Amino acid sequence: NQERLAECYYMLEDYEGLENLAISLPENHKLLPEIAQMFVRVGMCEQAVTAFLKCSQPKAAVDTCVHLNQWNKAVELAKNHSMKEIGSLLARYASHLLEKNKTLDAIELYRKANYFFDAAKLMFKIADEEAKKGSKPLRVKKLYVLSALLIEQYHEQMKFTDNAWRGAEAYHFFILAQRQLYEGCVDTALKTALHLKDYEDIIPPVEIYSLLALCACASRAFGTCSKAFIKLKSLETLSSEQKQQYEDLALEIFTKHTSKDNKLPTCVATGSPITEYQFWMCSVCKHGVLAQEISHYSFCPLCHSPVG
Amino acid sequence: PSIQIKRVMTYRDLDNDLMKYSAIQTLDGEIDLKLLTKVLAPEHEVREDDVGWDWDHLFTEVSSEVLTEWD
Ligand SMILES: [Zn+2]
Numbered sequence: 001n002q003e004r005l006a007e008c009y010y011m012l013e014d015y016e017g018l019e020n021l022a023i024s025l026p027e028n029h030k031l032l033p034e035i036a037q038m039f040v041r042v043g044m045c046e047q048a049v050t051a052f053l054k055c056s057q058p059k060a061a062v063d064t065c066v067h068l069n070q071w072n073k074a075v076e077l078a079k080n081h082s083m084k085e086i087g088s089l090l091a092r093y094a095s096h097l098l099e100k101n102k103t104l105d106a107i108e109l110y111r112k113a114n115y116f117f118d119a120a121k122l123m124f125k126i127a128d129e130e131a132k133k134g135s136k137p138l139r140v141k142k143l144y145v146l147s148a149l150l151i152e153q154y155h156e157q158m159k160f161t162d163n164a165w166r167g168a169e170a171y172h173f174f175i176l177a178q179r180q181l182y183e184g185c186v187d188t189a190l191k192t193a194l195h196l197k198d199y200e201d202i203i204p205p206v207e208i209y210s211l212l213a214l215c216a217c218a219s220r221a222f223g224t225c226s227k228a229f230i231k232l233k234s235l236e237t238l239s240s241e242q243k244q245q246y247e248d249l250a251l252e253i254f255t256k257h258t259s260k261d262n263k264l265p266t267c268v269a270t271g272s273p274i275t276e277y278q279f280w281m282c283s284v285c286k287h288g289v290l291a292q293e294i295s296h297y298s299f300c301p302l303c304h305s306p307v308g
Numbered sequence: 309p310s311i312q313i314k315r316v317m318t319y320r321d322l323d324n325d326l327m328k329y330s331a332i333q334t335l336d337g338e339i340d341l342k343l344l345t346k347v348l349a350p351e352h353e354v355r356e357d358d359v360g361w362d363w364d365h366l367f368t369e370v371s372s373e374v375l376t377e378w379d
Binding site for chain 2: 104107108126135136137138139142143145146149175178179181182184206207210211213214217218245246249252253256297298299301303304305306
């Protein structure tokens, strides 16, 4: 007996027995749709999808994935069985989620549904907002790393990364410069700040050049210090009082001391250029680290992927 | 704990920081660079330990901290 046996399994909540019964039935049967409905009610998306596909009802097999929010399977089955009506489903579901300010949920669905471009765009917007907000650099670095990872996943799907990983690198080198400055290695900190000067589009210019001027002052690089205050004063997003403060501090500094001073790939570990032709390269972030500093790190400093 | 003990601890804590960060806070000891030091970050904020950053756990952490920060 099949019809009553399924009911006995259901009431007994022996869902393993229900799955065994459903896989023991022939390809078609009057009972398989009922078993799949039971599975849907209890919440077993996978078993319900297999049961419906055994019934040869892909429409319901995708309607349950939509209903149970398993959008990966929904999109995959749409690609297989040629429905292609789930793109609008995902679009408006994510639109509703954004209307609820749950951008993270939208990113989660877009990652589940392999719509990696959309989630990457959302994370880029969030990272840009955080960068404008001037939050903790580590948080911005993490957000940019995740955005770049989504970009890389999209590119792997295809088979612009120079923008995503560059956005990550800007704040990574910011953090590295600050760390090197604190640790006392002033020369490396100054070199890292000079290298960071190229990413003024991501980090606000005021922070970049204030850090550069601080490194120059702490490292006796007064020529670069003057080159830093020139841009700092010339910045157009500064208040008149702030301009006066910067001018007065520069006046004091340059009355105290003289203003006159005395591309290759970049190593992630210390910001120095990678002079050697043979150098350790990451498997994900596509940015090298010098052969003399590879062994120190168990993960790639830029992207924290495993070394190898 | 003794009130005098609390006062002594507070005085030592206050005394610590000035000489702790006078190394980079000022130039040559007479010029104070408080204007430029404002863009720096706390020590512990720029410390990173070599730990694998998987997408899921990092995403959960950043989501939780964003939600705590966002209001
Ligand atoms: Zn890497």
